[PDB]
């Protein structure tokens, strides 16, 4: 099917152990990031190859050891499926070293490992992630061939540093300025130039930090696989038809592995059996075979039988895989609050189809210019129940497409009457209360108006934060596996930090909150 | 609105009601029977917990709890069912008309006070709590007690007593040869008299058409999903209820019946060791997960504790401009947050102030949402909603907060890379012409779920033993015929402009 190979290069130098008082050393942050990556790649049960190379250790072990070159570099784990052994190595039996290692030499070793181990299996996505602080001497002699080989072999490169271009994942500044060293500046310039050469002005977006990487899912950016495509034909009438492909842009993620019930003593599934039995509403508890049960439905004060075969024969039937545009309506007539369903579809033109792409682009541009949306009928297949949804244009400089979201039926709307609050006299706030609320809102604003471009920048973007439940589950499972007899650990501090707003808003929202408290009488009743 | 709904149908059984003026016109008695059947069907579908009763007055035979003469209570106040519908249909046809005449009789004296008294007695015989007490009087006569004034005064007194008690009465006047004059005698009996409904009526009542309009949709009374706690701070706290203004409609769950006798069958489950053969409880079981060759064992309580971050409720985090809330960032249906005030006093004023200030500043409140215990927290945005009412002061959008779930990073998926292809101005103009041709106004309730409607029709056919189930026309079809007839030659021009001749889509 699909497979990818990843090499994690980790610094082990003495500088890695340095830690400013009140702050965690970069070694701990790198260990946490690598542990998160390995947990995601192992508990997800995906066929991906992972290798780990430690540069900066006392010893030396690598294929490039013919002479006195590339010293203080050890290939801790070759290219193989990530088992628990890698987790134990990452957690317990890996300690900081004392001898510095060349970053360029470590990159050379990683690239050679990628090239050599990519003979048996087939990899379509080769990635190398370098974790370092750029505080060691290095030589640029091999840089040109490094870039040439990276471009020729189609190898993706990512960098993680203690600082960006204090609490972990706090949505705030990290590594305050004026602390970087001259050698760190030089290393930063070299990595910046390398990334610019590789990605072509996008490389600056591939240089993350441990604090950001802990809450951005950036490690798996180049590893995650694209979803399958749903082909269909958008038909406006009985003649016009455009071949289109729909993907699931947004869909709630759930754990695929399911807890298995096993016996308390033998810890085996075989010694557990679940049986379903049916009996009549009588004291004698008469037994009835599963084949003597008929499906029925309640009609009010009575139950009418409805056989499964009868239901299948009489059920509503329609042609499967239909994407028909019922009509076009003003975008204002469709409101977000009425959106239904558990998914959002992104519809593009059929791949490698110029005419379909042109037609879809024309439709999207016309809808955008007229400020309209298309009310359409959608059905995944024959069995899927027909749905009425709204498709609206989505035009971006990178790409343009349609966004489809289900709409509610006349039976799915609830008519609830709520007492008016504007005309109410018993709950009319006073001017002081309104002023206090305004001050609180102003103080707690999560968006900043950058005047350099006069744009709204989000200080607490919740869309990019990963789901904490998966990380918590992985941490607890790892703790139970490594320690078979021990209570589960508490929630990680960085998880809480990433789920909380920056300290700036909390500090600035003290006096307004006190004013709200003193100007609002609240008492439990 | 707390309680049930009680409806009593009073069908007059005089001679005039059994005669039809013109041909091809159903007699008023049959029309009343059809209206009652339609109401029964609508109640069965929408809400079967209500109570409906059918009482006939003016018949020769009498059946009442007091032994009043010339009054028959065909069906006492009880939940609707197929048996009552069939019993009513038995009188539907002309042969049913003959059966009703033979087994019930017609053309006898009656007193409106007596029928009102028996209706009140029926109302007082219901042990359940009744939110609405209503009576419907199906009669084409407007001057019943024209030959006696004492009966008129007795009926007036009884109607006044019923009105004082809380009984709400309607007169479903039917077609009459001469004409119906509500102002003559019935004006003083109706609970509410409209100024328009004063002239002589030469046709059927407008309420009959509304009653005959069958409705197929479950009606749910207002109910808060959860009375959660909003915490602007660890000390500042308010109570807010959560509602689902939009909820998916699912068909009623199937029930298992015994084929031999068609009775409910109880379903039970058990777990036991294959070796010891003894019953086991959830507390005597462990959860296992196998990853490769390793096995991890955790207790059920530990697994529940895994997904535990904070106590249930809403925790405020900050305010964000509405421009940053993307329309396509939709994961789950939005909810409605409204102040409760039944738990903590003074929350309503704070909620109103926050609503008006957010509307003024156009900022949505970001919050952390934990609907229940042992549930991972989510990030939600509360957008203030302005109370919107259409003409004639009817509310269409209540005031409160709209809670929209913000998708997480994992919930987002990356689309395959595509190469942009701009469309020329001519093609865009042609598409604009097509769209303008296919213009149409959209409303929230312009479509029906074909599956649910078909299921309801099939259930109706099965219950009533009808010959065939009336096919339900589905409005979800694109009616390509009309679209093709309207577009004209635009489609061909668009295809020529865009689609090459050797394409064959």
């Amino acid at each position: 099917g699909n497979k990818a190979a990843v090499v994690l290069c980790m610094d082990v130098g003495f500088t890695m152990s340095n830690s400013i008082p009140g702050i965690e050393s970069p070694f701990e942050q790198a260990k946490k990031v690598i542990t998160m990556f390995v947990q995601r790649q192992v508990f997800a049960e995906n066929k991906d190859e992972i290798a780990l190379v430690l540069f900066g250790t006392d010893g030396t072990d690598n294929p490039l050891s013919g002479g006195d070159q590339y010293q203080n570099i050890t290939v801790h784990r070759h290219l193989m499926l990530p088992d628990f052994d890698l987790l134990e190595d990452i957690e317990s039996k890996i300690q900081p070293g004392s001898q510095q290692a060349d970053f360029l030499d470590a990159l050379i070793v990683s690239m050679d490992v990628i090239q050599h181990e990519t003979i048996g299996k087939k990899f379509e996505k080769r990635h190398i992630e370098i974790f370092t602080d750029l505080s060691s001497r290095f030589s640029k002699s091999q840089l040109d061939i490094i870039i040439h080989s990276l471009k020729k072999c189609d190898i993706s490169l990512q960098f993680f540093l203690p600082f960006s271009l204090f609490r972990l994942g706090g949505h705030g500044p990290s590594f305050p300025l004026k602390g970087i060293t001259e050698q760190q500046k030089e290393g930063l310039e070299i990595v910046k130039m390398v990334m610019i050469s590789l990605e072509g002005e996008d490389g600056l977006d591939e240089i993350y930090s441990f604090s950001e990487s802990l809450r951005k899912l950036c490690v798996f950016k180049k590893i995650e696989r694209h979803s399958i495509h749903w082909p269909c034909r958008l038909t406006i009438g009985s003649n016009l038809s455009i071949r289109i492909a729909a993907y699931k842009s947004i869909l709630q993620e759930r754990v695929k592995k399911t807890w298995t019930v096993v016996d308390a003593k033998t810890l085996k599934k075989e010694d557990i059996q679940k049986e379903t039995v049916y009996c009549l509403n009588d004291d004698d508890e008469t037994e009835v075979l599963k084949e003597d049960i008929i499906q029925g439905f309640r009609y009010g004060s009575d139950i009418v039988p409805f056989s499964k075969v009868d239901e299948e024969q009489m059920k509503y039937k329609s042609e499967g895989k239909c994407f028909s545009v019922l009509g076009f309506c003003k975008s204002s007539q469709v409101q977000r609050r009425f959106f239904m369903g558990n998914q959002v579809l992104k519809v593009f033109a059929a791949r490698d189809d110029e005419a379909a792409a042109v037609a879809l682009s024309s439709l999207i541009h016309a809808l955008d210019d007229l400020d309209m949306v298309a009310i359409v009928r959608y059905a995944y297949d024959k069995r899927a129940n027909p749905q009425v949804g709204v498709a609206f244009p989505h035009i971006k400089h990178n790409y343009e497409c349609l966004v489809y979201v289900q709409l509610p039926f006349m039976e799915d709307l609830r008519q609830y009457m709520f007492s008016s609050l504007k005309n109410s006299k018993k709950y009319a706030p006073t001017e002081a209360q309104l002023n206090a609320v305004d001050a609180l809102i102003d103080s707690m604003s999560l968006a900043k108006k950058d005047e350099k471009t006069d744009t709204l920048e989000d200080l607490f973007p919740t869309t990019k934060i990963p789901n904490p439940r998966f990380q918590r589950l992985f941490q607890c499972l790892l703790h139970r596996a490594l320690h078979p007899r021990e209570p589960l650990p508490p929630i990680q501090q960085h998880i809480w930090n990433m789920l909380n707003p920056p300290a700036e808003v909390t500090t600035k929202s003290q006096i307004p909150l006190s004013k709200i408290k003193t100007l609002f009488p609240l008492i439990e009743a | 609105y707390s309680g049930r709904d009680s409806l009593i149908f009073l069908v007059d059984a005089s001679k005039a009601m059994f005669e039809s003026q013109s041909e091809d016109e159903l007699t008023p008695f049959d029309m009343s029977i059809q209206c009652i059947q339609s109401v029964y069907i609508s109640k069965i579908i929408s809400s079967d917990r209500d109570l409906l009763a059918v009482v006939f007055y003016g018949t020769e035979k009498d059946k009442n709890s007091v032994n009043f003469k010339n009054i028959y209570v065909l069906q006492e106040l009880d939940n609707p069912g197929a048996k009552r519908i069939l019993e009513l249909d038995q009188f539907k046809g002309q042969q049913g008309q003959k059966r009703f005449q033979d087994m019930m009789g017609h053309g006898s004296d009656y007193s409106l006070s007596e029928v009102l008294w028996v209706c009140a007695n029926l109302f007082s015989d219901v042990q359940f709590k009744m939110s609405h007490k209503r009576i419907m009087l199906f009669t084409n006569e407007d001057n019943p007690h024209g030959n006696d004034s004492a009966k008129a005064s007795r009926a007036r007194t009884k109607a006044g007593d019923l009105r004082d008690t809380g009984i709400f009465l309607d007169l479903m006047h039917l077609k009459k040869p001469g004409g119906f004059d509500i102002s003559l005698f019935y004006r003083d009996i109706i609970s509410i008299a409209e100024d328009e409904d004063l002239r002589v009526h030469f046709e059927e009542s407008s309420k009959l058409e509304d009653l005959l309009r069958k409705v197929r949709a479950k009606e749910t009374r207002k109910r808060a999903l959860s009375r959660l706690k909003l915490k602007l701070n660890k000390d500042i706290v308010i109570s807010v209820g959560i509602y689902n203004l939009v909820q998916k409609a699912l068909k009623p769950p199937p029930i298992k019946l015994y084929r031999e006798t068609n009775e409910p069958v109880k379903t039970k489950t058990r777990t036991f060791n294959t070796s010891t053969g003894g019953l086991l409880l959830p507390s005597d079981t462990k959860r296992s997960q196998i990853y490769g060759s390793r096995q991890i064992i955790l207790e059920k309580e530990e697994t529940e504790e895994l997904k535990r971050f904070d106590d249930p409720g809403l925790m405020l985090m900050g305010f964000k401009p509405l421009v940053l809330l993307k329309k396509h960032h939709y994961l789950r249906p939005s909810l409605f947050v409204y102040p409760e005030e039944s738990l903590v006093i003074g929350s309503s004023t704070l909620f109103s102030a926050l609503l008006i200030k957010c509307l003024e500043k156009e900022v949505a409140a970001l919050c952390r949402y934990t609907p229940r215990r042992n549930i991972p927290p989510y990030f939600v945005a509360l957008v203030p909603q302005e109370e919107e009412l259409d003409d004639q002061k009817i509310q269409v959008t209540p005031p409160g907060f709209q809670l929209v779930f913000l998708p997480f990073a994992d919930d987002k998926r990356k689309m395959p890379f595509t190469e942009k292809i701009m469309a020329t101005p001519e093609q865009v103009g042609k598409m604009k012409a097509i769209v303008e041709k296919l213009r149409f106004t959209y409303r929230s309730d312009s479509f029906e779920n074909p599956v649910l409607q078909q299921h309801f029709r099939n259930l109706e056919a099965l219950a009533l033993d009808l010959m065939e189930p009336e096919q339900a026309v589905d409005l979800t079809l694109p009616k390509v015929e009309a679209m093709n007839k309207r577009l004209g030659s635009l489609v061909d021009e668009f295809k020529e402009l865009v689609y090459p001749p050797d394409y064959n889509p």
């Binding site: - | 709904d5 929408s46 809400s47 509304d210 296919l438 409005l475 009309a482």
Partner: peptide, 23 residues
């Protein structure tokens, strides 16, 4: 209270679904 559903008191009457009516 015009528009109240006679069958279901307390619930506003709901117009039958008109489908797509082109202007």
């Amino acid at each position: 209270c015009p528009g109240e559903s006679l069958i279901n008191p307390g619930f506003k009457s709901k117009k039958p679904a008109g489908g797509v009516d082109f202007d």
